[PDB]
């Protein structure tokens, strides 16, 4: 249907990273990201996460 989480390739993208604005990850993998959490696409610091009421 849609693209899968860019990190695990097994789940639907379920949230948005701020401030870069990428929708690329699922919640769990986001938690898996090592601190300091950086966007898997542009490596900018993730300062806020806003869930997608999708999937």
């Amino acid at each position: 249907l849609k693209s899968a989480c860019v990190v695990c390739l097994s789940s639907f993208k379920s949230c948005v990273f701020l401030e870069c604005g990428h929708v690329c990850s699922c919640t769990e993998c986001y938690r898996a990201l090592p601190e300091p959490k950086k966007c898997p696409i542009c490596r900018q610091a993730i300062t806020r996460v806003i869930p997608l009421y999708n999937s």
């Binding site: 990190v7 390739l9 966007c39």
Partner: protein, 149 residues
């Protein structure tokens, strides 16, 4: 088991259904953390008709850390070592979990098409690459002929 292993397996499935253009990869035996890749030489390069082999070592913490990729086939290139070691940004500091082996191979092909002499891995080949482009192309073709094909 690990997240890296599941990542490598889903990545293997994506490669067995959507293989990258002019590229392929897979497990050397039963180990999932040791792969072999094949890049057929790009047409926008003195590396044409040549088939180049690479080795791939995945880290225990793989998607969060870059894969160690090296050439098996000898090659005449400014950013490629005699040890088959590759000088590529996305394999070092520009790495990110988004990147995949598909994207890495495609990037290496792009690196064969258009080298970066400003950050050379073989100083002399880089110097020839930006003084005598004919000599570079020529030798590259020859090395493509005695090792690749």
């Amino acid at each position: 088991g690990s997240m890296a292993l599941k990542r490598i397996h889903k990545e293997l499935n994506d490669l067995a259904r959507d293989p990258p253009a002019q590229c392929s990869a897979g497990p050397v035996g039963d180990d999932m953390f040791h792969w072999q890749a094949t890049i057929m030489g790009p047409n926008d390069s003195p590396y044409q008709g040549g088939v180049f082999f690479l080795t791939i070592h995945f880290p225990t913490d793989y998607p969060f850390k870059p894969p160690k990729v090296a050439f098996t086939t000898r090659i005449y290139h400014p950013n490629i070592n005699s040890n088959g070691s590759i000088c590529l940004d996305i394999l070092r500091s520009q790495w990110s979990p988004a990147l995949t082996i598909s994207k890495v191979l495609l990037s290496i092909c792009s690196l064969l098409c258009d080298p970066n002499p400003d950050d050379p891995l073989v100083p002399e080949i880089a110097r020839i690459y930006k003084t005598d482009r004919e000599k570079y192309n020529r030798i590259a073709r020859e090395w493509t002929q005695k090792y690749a094909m």
